Design an enzyme around this catalytic site. Structure first.
Site, short mmCIF file in Angstrom:
data_model
loop_
_atom_site.label_atom_id
_atom_site.label_comp_id
_atom_site.label_asym_id
_atom_site.label_seq_id
_atom_site.Cartn_x
_atom_site.Cartn_y
_atom_site.Cartn_z
CG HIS A 133 -1.96 -1.03 1.25
ND1 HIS A 133 -2.87 -1.22 0.23
CD2 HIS A 133 -2.24 -1.98 2.17
CE1 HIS A 133 -3.67 -2.23 0.53
NE2 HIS A 133 -3.29 -2.72 1.70
CG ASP A 171 -2.52 -8.35 0.89
OD1 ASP A 171 -3.59 -7.71 0.86
OD2 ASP A 171 -1.80 -8.39 1.89
CG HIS A 173 -6.42 -5.45 1.64
ND1 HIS A 173 -5.89 -6.30 2.58
CD2 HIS A 173 -7.59 -5.01 2.15
CE1 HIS A 173 -6.70 -6.37 3.62
NE2 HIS A 173 -7.75 -5.61 3.37
#
Ligand code: K
Ligand code: K
Ligand code: ZN
Length: 354
Positions: A133, A171, A173
């Site tokens: 992220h 992942d 996300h």
């Protein structure tokens, strides 16, 4: 035919000093490591040493402002650590966070170097805090520096600038930071599978939708596989690899595979809500091992059920070591068929294999 493994207990020093139960727990990495010991996987691996990333290496992907701000947190009083963390989306900081982020990145550089010098065939990196992220200019979602993106640029820096690196991000996300870092780049193919829910699932941006295919010379080198409206598991992930990940990857012909290997799509995860099994993760790993002459580096990202991430990533290492793929126990959820078809519509213009 050697598998490397990097783990350093010093990465557990990064912690939440106000919430001892925050899910991005120091014992995430010690639990994975312990499970490798119990399964006697550890002695089958060559230990790759951790090291600190340099600021010059961080600058491969991050601004000097961002590096300096996170660096400054090492000497910050608790009130200022709390305030600085609150300036980001979903970040906690302690005085050890900067060093641990440096250790996670440097550990992965050493692992990529060991692969690209032929010292190991492949490697697993049991590191934290996670990375995918993190953006050029900011921390986000428990991530300070984008370890996998930095490792891709590091690999190019010790081989050739245009080394073809595939990053598979499984992942649960979307890796917003990885997508953005390479969105205009044809040398780094980013493929993400992620819970999307029409933008409602973290990180809450329509940047994660299937129609974001890359920009400029990177048009076609960003592949988003978004899940909506269903508890996805092994059938959906196997189908996505079959129809999308592996045909695209083979056509790209990577010279190095990095896995942004979060295990928060695993059954039992308190945040992902999905049900991929450890056997499923082994099969995804085994498929990726067919690429890049086996040069695969598995990099821990998210994953917050300690038992699930320990079994899941241990099964991935077992695959890297050459063990037989485990036995897998169903028709796809209807929306997963729609997701895969939407990605095929978006990318068949760019990939002749589709
Ligand atoms: K992902
Ligand atoms: K790209
Ligand atoms: Zn995640």
């Amino acid at each position: 035919p050697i598998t490397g493994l990097v783990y350093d207990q010093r990465m557990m020093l990064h912690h939440n000093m106000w919430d001892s139960h925050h899910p991005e727990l120091p014992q995430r990495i010690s639990r994975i490591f312990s499970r490798h010991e119990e399964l006697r996987l550890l002695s089958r691996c060559h230990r790759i040493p951790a090291r600190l990333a340099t600021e010059e290496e961080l600058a491969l992907c991050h601004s000097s402002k961002h590096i300096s701000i996170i660096k400054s947190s090492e000497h910050m009083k608790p009130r200022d650590l709390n305030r600085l963390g609150d300036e980001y989306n979903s970040i906690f900081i302690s005085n050890e966070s900067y060093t641990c982020a440096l250790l996670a990145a440097g550990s992965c550089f050493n692992s990529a170097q060991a692969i690209l010098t032929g010292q190991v065939r492949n490697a697993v990196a049991i590191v934290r805090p996670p990375g995918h992220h993190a953006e050029k200019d900011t921390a986000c979602g428990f991530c300070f520096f984008n370890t996998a993106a930095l490792t891709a640029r590091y690999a190019q820096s010790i081989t050739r600038e245009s080394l073809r690196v595939l990053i598979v991000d499984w992942d649960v996300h979307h890796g917003n930071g990885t997508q953005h870092i390479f969105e205009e780049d044809d040398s780094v193919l980013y493929i993400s599978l992620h819970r999307y829910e029409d933008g409602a699932f973290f990180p809450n941006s329509e940047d994660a939708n299937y129609d974001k295919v890359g920009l400029g010379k990177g048009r076609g080198y960003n592949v988003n596989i978004p899940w909506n409206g269903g508890k996805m598991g092994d059938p959906e992930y196997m189908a996505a690899f079959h129809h999308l990940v592996m045909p695209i990857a083979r056509e790209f012909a990577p010279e190095l595979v990095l896995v942004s290997a979060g295990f928060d799509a695993a059954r039992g995860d308190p945040l992902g809500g999905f049900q991929v099994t450890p056997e499923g993760y082994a099969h995804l790993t085994h498929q990726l091992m067919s690429l890049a002459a086996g040069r695969v580096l598995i990099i821990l990202e998210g994953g917050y059920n300690l038992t699930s991430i320990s079994e899941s990533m241990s099964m991935c290492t077992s695959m890297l070591l050459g063990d037989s793929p485990p036995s897998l126990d169903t028709p796809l959820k209807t929306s997963a068929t729609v997701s895969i078809n939407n990605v095929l519509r978006a990318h068949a213009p760019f990939w002749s294999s589709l």
